[PDB]
Amino acid sequence: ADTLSDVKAKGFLQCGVNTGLLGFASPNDKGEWSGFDVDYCRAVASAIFGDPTKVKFTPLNAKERFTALQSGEVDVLIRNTTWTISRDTSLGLDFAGINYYDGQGFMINSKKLAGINSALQLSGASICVQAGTTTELNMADYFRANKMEYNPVVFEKIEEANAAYDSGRCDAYTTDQSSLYGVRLALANPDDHVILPEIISKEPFGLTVRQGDARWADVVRWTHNALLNAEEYGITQANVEEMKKSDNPDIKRLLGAEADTKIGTDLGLDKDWVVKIIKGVGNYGEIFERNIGSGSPLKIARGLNAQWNKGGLQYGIPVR
Amino acid sequence: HADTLSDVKAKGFLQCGVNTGLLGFASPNDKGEWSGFDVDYCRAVASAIFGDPTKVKFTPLNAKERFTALQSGEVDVLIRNTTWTISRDTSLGLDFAGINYYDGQGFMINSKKLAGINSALQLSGASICVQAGTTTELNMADYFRANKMEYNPVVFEKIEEANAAYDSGRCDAYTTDQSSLYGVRLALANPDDHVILPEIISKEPFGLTVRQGDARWADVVRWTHNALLNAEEYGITQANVEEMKKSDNPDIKRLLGAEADTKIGTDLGLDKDWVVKIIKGVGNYGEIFERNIGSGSPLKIARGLNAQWNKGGLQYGIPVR
Ligand SMILES: N[C@@H](CCC(=O)N[C@@H](CS)C(=O)NCC(=O)O)C(=O)O
Numbered sequence: 001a002d003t004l005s006d007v008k009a010k011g012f013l014q015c016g017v018n019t020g021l022l023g024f025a026s027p028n029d030k031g032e033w034s035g036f037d038v039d040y041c042r043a044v045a046s047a048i049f050g051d052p053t054k055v056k057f058t059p060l061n062a063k064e065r066f067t068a069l070q071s072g073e074v075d076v077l078i079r080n081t082t083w084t085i086s087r088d089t090s091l092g093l094d095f096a097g098i099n100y101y102d103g104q105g106f107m108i109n110s111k112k113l114a115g116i117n118s119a120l121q122l123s124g125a126s127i128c129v130q131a132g133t134t135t136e137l138n139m140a141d142y143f144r145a146n147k148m149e150y151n152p153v154v155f156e157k158i159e160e161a162n163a164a165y166d167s168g169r170c171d172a173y174t175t176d177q178s179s180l181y182g183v184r185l186a187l188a189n190p191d192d193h194v195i196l197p198e199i200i201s202k203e204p205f206g207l208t209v210r211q212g213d214a215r216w217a218d219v220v221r222w223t224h225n226a227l228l229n230a231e232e233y234g235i236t237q238a239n240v241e242e243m244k245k246s247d248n249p250d251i252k253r254l255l256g257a258e259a260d261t262k263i264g265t266d267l268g269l270d271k272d273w274v275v276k277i278i279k280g281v282g283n284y285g286e287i288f289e290r291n292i293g294s295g296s297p298l299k300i301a302r303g304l305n306a307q308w309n310k311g312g313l314q315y316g317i318p319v320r
Numbered sequence: 321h322a323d324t325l326s327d328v329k330a331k332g333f334l335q336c337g338v339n340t341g342l343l344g345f346a347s348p349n350d351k352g353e354w355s356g357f358d359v360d361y362c363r364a365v366a367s368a369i370f371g372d373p374t375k376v377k378f379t380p381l382n383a384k385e386r387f388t389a390l391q392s393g394e395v396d397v398l399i400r401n402t403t404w405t406i407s408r409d410t411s412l413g414l415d416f417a418g419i420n421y422y423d424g425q426g427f428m429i430n431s432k433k434l435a436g437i438n439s440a441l442q443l444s445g446a447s448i449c450v451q452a453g454t455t456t457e458l459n460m461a462d463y464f465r466a467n468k469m470e471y472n473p474v475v476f477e478k479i480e481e482a483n484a485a486y487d488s489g490r491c492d493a494y495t496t497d498q499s500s501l502y503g504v505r506l507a508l509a510n511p512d513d514h515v516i517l518p519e520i521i522s523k524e525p526f527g528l529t530v531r532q533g534d535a536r537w538a539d540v541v542r543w544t545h546n547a548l549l550n551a552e553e554y555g556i557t558q559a560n561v562e563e564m565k566k567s568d569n570p571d572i573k574r575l576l577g578a579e580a581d582t583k584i585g586t587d588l589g590l591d592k593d594w595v596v597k598i599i600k601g602v603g604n605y606g607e608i609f610e611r612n613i614g615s616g617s618p619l620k621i622a623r624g625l626n627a628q629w630n631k632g633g634l635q636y637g638i639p640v641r
């Protein structure tokens with residue numbers, strides 16, 4: 001398998017993304033896509049083509065997402081998809097990096113459910129969840145462990161889950177916490193909804209590729225680690241051109257300005273592949289802020305997804 | 321058609337590339353018995369597979385022969401304070417299954433011989449020993465160039481040579497990964513006279529290194545690592561794991577293979593109780609850390625970056641789910 005060569009030859013990247021989740025991957029009226037995971041797709045396209053528009057988006061629901069990657073319909077799956085051992089071992093898939101560390105939570109309507117302030121008060125609740133998710137299984141674990149009753153209402157379409165929760169048919173919504181922010185913004189009265197404090201699982205969102213093509217996994221992995229290194233070194237969409245002439249050898253090396261460097265070409269890309277990425281989408285923090293952080297209606301704090309040296313878990317492996 | 325797992329089970333032991341001799345990480349005694357942080361990681365993989373942490377043979381490798389030994393098939397895995405970098409990921413036919421220790425490059429001096437020095441920025445002109453075939457050598461050049469310091473490296477082929485030249489005073493300073501400086505220092509004539517300066521000049525994530533093209537084998541190494549992390553997070557130890565197997569906690573039951581009709585271990589190519597085998601063999605991540613390089617060792621390194629993710633560090637066990 002040589003996915004990179006195939007991608008170069010067709011001139012665009014085919015990406016599996018969400019059907020519609022605000023902040024992460026959502027289309028406008030014209031079918032134009034934006035979001036955190038979308039920008040990660042555009043980052044890979046930027047690394048390869050120097051053009052973040054060279055992407056074709058395939059929206060996938062929770063049940064069809066893995067099949068679409070296995071069959072080669074999409075080249076990469078970037079779609080709030082949790083890295084787990086069973087997905088790593090039993091599906092013929094690998095993970096090239098974690099672009100967002102999350103965890104599972106519960107959301108309620110505070111006007112309808114007065115006095116509920118903890119997930120441990122939800123015994124008896126009807127709770128909507130989607131089939132084909134970690135979410136369904138973790139909820140079962142949590143309620144069993146805490147000796148609570150519950151009525152799972154299982155959906156195949158996110159639109160149906162959203163509707164059943166918003167109508168009051170379901171008392172609570174469960175999914176990844178960052179997704180609850182996005183779901184909330186699509187409801188009738190977003191301000192009425194409270195994400196409860198409990199986080200009941202680890203949900204590291206993975207950059208998902210097929211096994212058996214290390215060169216392709218390398219390209220995806222190092223696009224991610226380039227976004228991280230760029231933010232750590234203060235390299236932005238706005239200054240990256242200027243940063244090519246930096247005195248800092250780390251920065252010079254990252255941006256392909258070093259004498260006889262072979263980093264980009266060993267990866268199968270051009271020497272200035274990181275310049276292309278950062279011009280295309282900015283660094284990791286810029287992607288975060290415009291889509292799900294302070295530059296967005298979601299206002300999610302960096303938290304676990306801060307840089308490693310600022311208290312977070314996001315650690316750019318060295319471009320060395 | 322590569323299948324290292326099958327070949328490992330067929331020959332009946334695991335062949336591991338390790339250090340020639342670095343206290344705390346990988347060191348043989350007089351009888352050729354091995355111990356250390358990276359050594360225990362090797363034994364963890366052996367326990368996952370064979371249920372016996374001694375079903376392993378060790379291949380000592382200097383900085384220059386370590387990648388060749390893995391590429392050639394002479395060793396099945398390389399666990400040897402080896403930094404994950406893009407060039408090692410893209411140009412050698414190798415992959416990395418995980419990061420078992422986040423480190424960074426530092427400098428060590430004899431504070432008795434070099435009094436008045438408290439910063440690496442005061443090292444202009446100093447003779448500094450370093451090994452060939454390392455990230456270390458390249459980063460030092462970068463650091464001295466960037467900071468306009470006079471650059472006087474002394475490059476060695478073997479660690480014993482570097483250690484002797486530094487201790488004898490032929491070199492003014494020693495540079496390598498900070499955790500390694502702790503280990504080197506313990507081998508010197510008077511360990512107490514040596515100070516590790518505050519500056520950290522690089523990222524050095526130590527990686528579990530395997531050949532590309534064998535996903536099944538990479539999964540085994542990767543998930544040995546993450547099992548070690550998850551077990552520590554869940555308070556599962558060498559001493560209590562047999563008891564924890566009877567836990568009502570669903571996460572623990574699933575991790576330790578006590579769930580009904582679970583397929584986690586067998587999908588990995590191992591037995592259902594593969595994590596119980598690991599923890600019985602070597603204990604959890606924290607136990608490996610403490611006995612070798614932490615407060616239960618002469619090195620006394622703080623967890624720091626290698627603390628659990630929910631205790632202020634970077635070490636994050638991917639869910640066994
Ligand atoms: N991270 C979890 C949940 C992923 C997931 O699919 N979440 C839902 C709820 S936010 C979603 O994205 N639905 C969109 C769709 O299925 O079309 C997993 O990997 O199983």
Ligand SMILES: N[C@@H](CCC(=O)N[C@@H](CS)C(=O)NCC(=O)O)C(=O)O
Nearest residue numbers: 340382383401402403454455479500
């Ligand atoms: N982490 C650095 C340095 C690794 C390294 O080889 N360090 C030396 C100095 S502590 C070592 O292990 N020497 C033992 C030997 O070469 O036999 C790298 O991967 O390049």
Ligand code: NA
Nearest residue numbers: 088089093094
């Ligand atoms: Na895999």
Ligand code: NA
Nearest residue numbers: 409410414415
């Ligand atoms: Na690789």
